[PDB]
Amino acid sequence: DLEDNWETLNDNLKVIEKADNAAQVKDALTKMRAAALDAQKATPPKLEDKSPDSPEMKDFRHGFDILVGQIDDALKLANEGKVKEAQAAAEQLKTTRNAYIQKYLGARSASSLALAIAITALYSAVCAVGLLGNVLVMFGIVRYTKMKTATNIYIFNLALADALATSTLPFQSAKYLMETWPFGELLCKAVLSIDYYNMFTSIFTLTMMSVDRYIAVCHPVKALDFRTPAKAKLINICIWVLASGVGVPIMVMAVTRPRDGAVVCMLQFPSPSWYWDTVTKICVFLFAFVVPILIITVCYGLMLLGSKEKDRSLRRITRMVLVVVGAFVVCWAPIHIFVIVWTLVDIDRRDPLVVAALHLCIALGYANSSLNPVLYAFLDENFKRCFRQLC
């Protein structure tokens, strides 16, 4: 609410500095005076919850009574037609603002801190699970010769992308808490492109697992030729190369720049950025979400259409993939919707309940990576055994 008011002071100030007449100068002043009075009413973060009559609080409030006074002065001039004089008077109050009140602003809200700590918690929590949980999955598959299944080789691929994903989390946590990116450009590039690799390689593998189940079920004759592990490895590598059609351009495009007191990691789309940004944001929604989903739904639709333990086994393994597919969807469906709203429907983007909910369901996205290894070891018996065998 206050930074909003401080925003309109600054903005109206430079409207006066670019003005050509008394009316439009006057109007601007009259806005600032309102801004400065609703700002005076407000308590700022540096003064989190001091005595409503502490020296520092009395002193902050004073700064505004001063500023207002000066606005009523400039407004007396503009009223009398004295434009330039009103403009000069406006110049001196930018300073009088900064000299007195500015020392009270800039700090982070206690709520905001709480969010940051809450995130760091969840992140650390996800991170400790997923990073562990998928290193196990990756270790378990390679080590034990008994585990080289076509579908399991695809899982390896997921456990890899998920692992890589969950290695970036503490860096994001530190970025949130300390309000800056202290890790340098290379690692900025590393972290973002990893975040994109994670989305595509996952959803492409999950499409190919689905394609895999389908040929398994509906074309068991044909399957024997295409359902080998060596080939799954090949498709895994294809999934990665293909994904690099989106991952490498981000690798280059991602960069580190200083902005308004901090260092921030971000994407740099060739101008127009806001357009190309949307372009990509749509493609990621189509080609890493709906379009692969439609394929999966088809694959699964068709399977609605042999020995004792093998028929039971297919069912169990097939039913596993649907859950991980579904579990995936429900984790990412929230955030993929939110981002498309965020970048098309102009809602209110600074609200507590909004920002939190966004962050609190980006978190769900990343929670998908810690969930996976659990689902593997609770819906696959061989995984269930291995995980409680170790310890």
Binding site: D195, Y196, M266, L267, K281, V284, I335, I362
Partner: peptide, 4 residues
């Protein structure tokens, strides 16, 4: 995902 996502970011600036």
């Amino acid at each position: 995902y996502x970011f600036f």
